[PDB]
Each structure stands twice: as structure tokens, then as C-alpha cells.
From Swiss-Prot, chains A, B:
Species, as recorded: Tetradesmus obliquus
Main location: plastid
Any one of the GO CC terms: chloroplast thylakoid lumen
Post-translational modification: Binds 1 heme c group covalently per subunit.
Protein name: Cytochrome c6
Alphabetized UniProt keyword annotations: Chloroplast, Electron transport, Heme, Iron, Metal-binding, Photosynthesis, Plastid, Thylakoid, Transport
Function: Functions as an electron carrier between membrane-bound cytochrome b6-f and photosystem I in oxygenic photosynthesis.
Amino acid sequence: SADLALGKQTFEANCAACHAGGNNSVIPDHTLRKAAMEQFLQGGFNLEAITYQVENGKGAMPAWSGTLDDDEIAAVAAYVYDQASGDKW
Amino acid sequence: SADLALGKQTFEANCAACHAGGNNSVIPDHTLRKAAMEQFLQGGFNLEAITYQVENGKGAMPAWSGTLDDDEIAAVAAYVYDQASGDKW
Ligand code: HEM
Ligand code: HEM
């Protein structure tokens, strides 16, 4: 299913630098919150969209394929998704 | 067994700050290599000694029992142990 522990640690080790607190320090309005994603994430607010962006990157956001493994990409995507849907940031 | 992927991400998120590359930026000779640990780690170079220090801390090194859960502690201890034994640092 979803290893949110692996998710959280992967998030801290690789994403926190630009997305601490569910925010976006590079492009301020493209945060990791539900609303923002529903509006800016290509593919919609769903696990598929998040995973695809993590794998391939987007603009100033780097690609994580070949850096993270599918388990790590999957867990971090679930973590981001769960934090967002639950308003947990 | 302890998941080494979780171990790697836990190490990066929480330990890399002072132990990047298996080194020690605070007390230079107290590195994460087998020899160093054989000499300085209470209990000698073994998985259990590593786990105990991570849980409890030592001097300037903080304790992690609050910050990390048992699976993350077990995983990071295994990762550090495997890196040192294979001289992978
Ligand atoms: C870590 C592996 C990581 C994750 C997870 C992550 C997620 C992510 C999402 C879901 C978005 C979409 C948000 C939205 O409202 O559309 C997104 C967007 C951007 N990110 Fe990211 N991101 C991760 C890592 C990083 C890192 C390391 C940086 C900084 C160098 C970063 C930056 C950005 C930027 C910029 C965007 C917007 C991309 C665009 O639409 O142009 N992310 N990220
Ligand atoms: C992350 C959770 C983490 C781990 C793993 C870790 C391991 C570790 C070991 C096994 C030793 C012993 C090395 C030896 O040769 O004896 C050790 C020692 C020290 N560490 Fe550490 N460490 C982790 C995290 C941190 C962090 C974030 C810092 C810096 C703030 C830090 C620093 C130190 C220091 C200093 C020591 C020496 C302790 C002493 O004997 O006086 N560690 N670490």
C-alpha cells in the first residue's frame, strides 16, 4: 500500500529543501496543498499526477527517476497526497 | 529484516548533516567507518552498538528515540552498518 514512514523520510531528505511545510520556495503559489495542486498540477490532484511529476520533474522542479527507486517515488507521492488531502501541513 | 531503502533515506534526512560521506564534522576522527567505530563506539562495531547510540545519543550527538520510530532506527542502523562493513563510505 503506502509506506508513509518511507514517504516522510524521503520527503525530508529530498523535497524539504524547496517544499518545507507544504510550501514552494521557488514559485510561491505552486504549493503542496490540495487547492494549489487542483489548479496547477498537470493530470489533476491524484496519486498518478504527483508520481508522474516526481519522476519527470517540471520546470524548476528536478526529475527524481534514477535518483529515487519506485518504492521511494511511490511512498513520497502517497505522503504528499495524504498530507494534502488531510490538510496536515 | 530492516529495509535498507528506509535506512538510506533516514540517514540522509537526519544524519547526513554531520556524517556526510561517513565522516564526522564535529569530532573528525569519530567517523562512521568500521575502524573508527571499533575504537570509539561503546560496544564495538556491531549493529546493536550502533542502534543504542542512535537511540540514546552521546555527548554532542543527539538522541533519536523521539524523532525516529523503531523501524527507522533499525533501518538507519542497518544502513550505517552495511556501509561501514563493506567500506562503502
Ligand atoms: C521530492 C522528491 C519532491 C516532491 C515530492 C515534490 C512534489 C511537487 C509537487 C506535487 C508539485 C506540484 C505543486 C503544485 O501546486 O502544482 C511540485 C511543484 C514544484 N516543485 Fe517539487 N517536489 C519535490 C522536490 C522539489 C525540489 C527539490 C525543488 C527545488 C529545487 C522543487 C521545486 C518545485 C517547483 C519549482 C515546482 C513547480 C513546478 C512547475 O510547475 O513549474 N521540488 N513539486
Ligand atoms: C542519524 C540518525 C545519526 C546516526 C546513524 C549517527 C551515527 C553515529 C555513530 C555510529 C557514531 C559513532 C562513530 C564512532 O566512530 O564512534 C556517531 C558519533 C557522533 N555523531 Fe552521529 N549519527 C547521527 C546523527 C548525528 C548528528 C545529526 C550529529 C551532528 C549534530 C552527530 C554528531 C556526532 C558526534 C559528535 C559523534 C561523536 C560522539 C562522541 O562519542 O562524543 N550525529 N554518530
